[PDB]
Design a protein around this ligand. Structure first.
Ligand SMILES: *[C@@H]1O[C@H](CO)[C@@H](O)[C@H](O)[C@H]1NC(C)=O
Ligand SMILES: *[C@@H]1O[C@H](CO)[C@@H](O)[C@H](O)[C@H]1NC(C)=O
Ligand SMILES: *[C@@H]1O[C@H](CO)[C@@H](O)[C@H](O)[C@H]1NC(C)=O
Lengths: 306, 144, 17
């Protein structure tokens, strides 16, 4: 489930793991499961293998908890191993402290720039700008797989809609990978002013290095938590035109090859890039599988834009 | 306490007629709990059809005959039944007491056969999901 | 045809005008 408090339910019995059927799986059964794990209240009872198919026995079926049982095996059931289900029917849960983070944008297809919202207790809410550092934004961008760093944008004064806020004063040390380990204020449902909403932009997944201008240089892309290069195999003027466009540089003037501006570093993320020159993003172009290159850094691609 | 049989020929009338049985006294190993399924565990028959290979299915489970509900008897189970009764291949399954209502107990258990089993006694059984079946829906089979 | 993983619990039903 992407965290300790959501996922497919597995029971340890007689030395082996087994599953539970989603037949009669209700919020009271999920509430018993969630309480047994100390995960608080059940927010959603998911059926139909929402978290994928399990393996092994289906241990319990036709669950009829009263919701007061301290353990799932204390609920009334057909009994151990008496079931007619298959693993396509494995039950799962999501509890209220299952938390998830996202950036929501209304104006961009850019998954890595937007208003910072957290899901908690069944609802999305804004994060307060108070005490937020660029280190915290970096944590957010890494956790989202966006980039190592990012900037807090000023909020658009033109929005009149008040959003629920969950937390403010979020302070992360260097080290933590998720915002949850970072001390903050307690959970408090308040109405945000538009000025307290945190809007962040992670830097671009694309940069130019070692060129004479901000619109010329070796093409580097951020993927898998590292910077990497693009192989010059098939690298053409339409690819450079696409590269120039994501950076907001004007038309491509030249596509350079053979690491003219020096060799790059780390993984060669893309090889045989074959853009049409009208894509919104280099990620939208047909290429070989990410991170599979036969090229060396001698073949690092470069651009010169207007 | 465990009973050990060293061997009988198999033509004996009683287990007590098998020779050299050991009652207790030897340190049984970790391979306990032998369990039999006999041919009379579940016995099918067809009743009330115009031919012996056609009729309402009644199965003796224990010493009691019971009908099977039309919801609880698959095509695979009918194939197993038709083979066990030596009636050939399944031609049709017929719901709605097409051959008349059974009498007495109706078994509330589903046969999860794979269809290769020699007898329904070897087929897995599942408990019926909540529901009263009535004899108006007793299943009938026609074999080939 | 005739190859299904479902039980009769998953029998489809309809209600039309
Ligand atoms: C259960 O999870 C889904 C996941 O998208 C969510 O949309 C839905 O609202 C949840 N159930 C309830 C009752 O809120
Ligand atoms: C393209 O590259 C040349 C030399 O490689 C550089 O001097 C120039 O500034 C770039 N083009 C333009 C129009 O700036
Ligand atoms: C749909 O089904 C309900 C019961 O499930 C039934 O009462 C109703 O008549 C059907 N719909 C309409 C519009 O008649």
């Amino acid at each position: 489930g992407g965290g300790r408090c959501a996922g497919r339910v597995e029971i340890y019995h007689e030395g082996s793991w087994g599953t539970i059927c989603d037949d009669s799986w209700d919020l009271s059964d999920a509430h018993v499961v969630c309480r047994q794990l100390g995960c608080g209240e059940a927010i959603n009872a998911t059926g139909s293998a929402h978290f994928g198919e399990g393996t092994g026995p289906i241990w319990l079926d036709e669950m009829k908890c009263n919701g007061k049982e301290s353990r799932i095996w204390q609920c009334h059931s057909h009994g151990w191993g008496q079931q007619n289900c298959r693993h396509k029917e494995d039950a799962g849960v999501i509890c209220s402290e299952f938390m998830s983070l996202r950036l929501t944008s209304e104006a961009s297809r850019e998954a890595c720039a937007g208003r910072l919202e957290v899901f908690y207790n069944g609802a999305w809410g804004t994060v307060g700008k108070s005490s937020m550092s660029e280190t915290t934004v970096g944590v957010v961008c890494r956790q989202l797989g966006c980039a190592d760093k990012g900037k807090i944008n000023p909020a658009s004064l033109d929005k009149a809609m008040s959003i629920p806020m969950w937390v403010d004063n979020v302070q992360c040390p260097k080290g933590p990978d998720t915002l949850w380990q970072c001390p903050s204020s307690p959970w408090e449902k308040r109405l945000a002013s538009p000025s307290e909403e945190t809007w962040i932009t992670c830097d671009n997944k694309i940069r130019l290095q070692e060129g004479p201008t901000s619109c010329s240089g070796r093409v580097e892309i951020w993927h898998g938590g590292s910077w990497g290069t693009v192989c010059d195999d098939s690298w053409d003027l339409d690819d450079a035109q696409v590269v120039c466009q994501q950076l907001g540089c004007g038309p491509a003037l030249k596509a350079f090859k053979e690491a003219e501006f020096g060799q790059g570093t780390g993984p060669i993320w893309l090889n045989e890039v074959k853009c049409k020159g009208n894509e919104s993003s280099l990620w939208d172009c047909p290429a070989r599988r990410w991170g599979h290159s036969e090229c060396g850094h001698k073949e690092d691609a470069a651009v010169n834009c207007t | 306490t465990w009973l050990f049989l060293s061997s009988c020929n198999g033509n004996e009338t009683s287990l007590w007629d098998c020779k050299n049985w050991q009652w207790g006294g030897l340190t049984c190993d970790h391979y306990e709990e032998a369990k039999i399924t006999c041919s009379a565990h579940r016995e099918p028959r067809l009743v009330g059809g115009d031919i012996p290979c056609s009729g309402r299915v009644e199965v003796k489970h224990g010493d009691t005959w019971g009908s099977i509900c039309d919801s609880d008897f698959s095509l695979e189970a009918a194939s197993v039944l038709c083979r066990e009764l030596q009636c050939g291949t399944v031609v049709s399954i017929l719901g709605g007491a097409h051959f008349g209502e059974g009498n007495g107990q109706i078994w509330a258990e589903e046969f999860q056969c794979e269809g290769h089993e020699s007898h329904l006694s070897l087929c897995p059984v599942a408990p019926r999901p909540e529901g009263t079946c009535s004899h108006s829906r007793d299943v009938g089979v026609v074999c080939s």
